[PDB]
Design a protein around this ligand. Structure first.
Ligand SMILES: CC(C)c1cnn2c(NCc3ccccc3)cc(NC[C@@H]3CCNC[C@H]3O)nc12
Length: 278
């Protein structure tokens, strides 16, 4: 029912093609991937928001799974690699952050988490919109990147909360601003140790219950924190204050997406259009 145009990427969950529906003329992203997955995925069809890549259809046929998504022309990694010499301008960074926080406040209010936010999962159009892609696919179901993984996941917490998406988004914010990934780990311990080196080794004072976590070891080295002004210059004081609340160790103290939308950093938010080369 779909004509493959080109290979657009390769996810955890299978390979993705830009495709054309032969009956409608519609251009879509076709992703080819147990009764349990079916019901979860079908619940995603109703989870609709302008800052979430629209799931158009779930095609369970000939004992196979295809997800048909809205197509967007560009991802945030490629826009960042392409914006490398001058950086993404601040008003655009802020507008993308604000829109992503809208999409997360939406999903989280419906008790749906992403779990794997990353620049390659954040898709942009020519209208200045940014959208979350693959929402809900990790709960429904190449080396997987760890750079955006929240410390409670890395510490083996089995029951992650919406706080894990705020951490990832925090990491992406820092990266848009500095033009470098914040925590580029290449293994779980390297990832954890890069977080500790920047934010301090967490203890019982900043994160109660931490030393009881499954993969916590008393033997972790103990590094002191660094100042956000060393970590993300040239971000201003409001952006630094928001980021630090998005990067709180304790997931219970981490700001929510809805509180983050009220933060003074967003007082002058606007919706710029990007210069996009397609
Ligand atoms: C949510 C999906 C299925 C969708 C809709 N548009 N789009 C684009 N568009 C950006 C793009 C366009 C042309 C060439 C490369 C990338 C890229 C893309 N890449 C797939 C990766 C692997 C699976 N999960 C999402 C992403 O990490 N997935 C999607």
């Amino acid at each position: 029912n779909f004509q493959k145009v080109e290979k657009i990427g390769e996810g955890t969950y299978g390979v993705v093609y830009k495709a054309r529906n032969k009956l409608t003329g519609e251009v879509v992203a076709l992703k080819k991937i147990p009764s349990t997955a079916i019901r979860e995925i079908s619940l995603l069809k109703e989870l609709n928001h302008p800052n979430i890549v629209k799931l158009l259809d779930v095609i369970h046929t000939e004992n196979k799974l295809y997800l048909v998504f809205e197509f967007l022309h560009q991802d945030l990694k490629k826009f960042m690699d392409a914006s490398a010499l001058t950086g993404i301008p601040l008003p655009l960074i802020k507008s993308y952050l604000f829109q992503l926080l809208q999409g997360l406040a939406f999903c989280h209010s419906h008790r749906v988490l992403h779990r794997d936010l990353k620049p390659q999962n954040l898709l942009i159009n020519t209208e200045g919109a940014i959208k979350l892609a693959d929402f809900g696919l990790a709960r429904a179901f190449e080396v997987v990147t760890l750079w955006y993984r929240a410390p409670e996941i890395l510490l083996g917490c089995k029951y992650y909360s919406t706080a894990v998406d705020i951490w990832s988004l925090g990491c992406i914010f820092a990266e848009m601003v500095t033009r470098r990934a914040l925590f580029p780990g290449d293994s779980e311990i390297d990832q954890l140790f890069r977080i500790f080196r920047t934010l301090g080794t967490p203890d019982e004072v900043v994160w109660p219950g931490v030393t009881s976590m499954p993969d916590y070891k008393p033997s972790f080295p103990k590094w002191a924190r660094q100042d956000f002004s060393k970590v993300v210059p040239p971000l201003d004081e409001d952006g630094r204050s928001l980021l630090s609340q998005m990067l709180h160790y304790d997931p219970n103290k981490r700001i929510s997406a809805k509180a983050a939308l009220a933060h003074p950093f967003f007082q002058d938010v606007t919706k710029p259009v990007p210069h996009l080369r397609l």
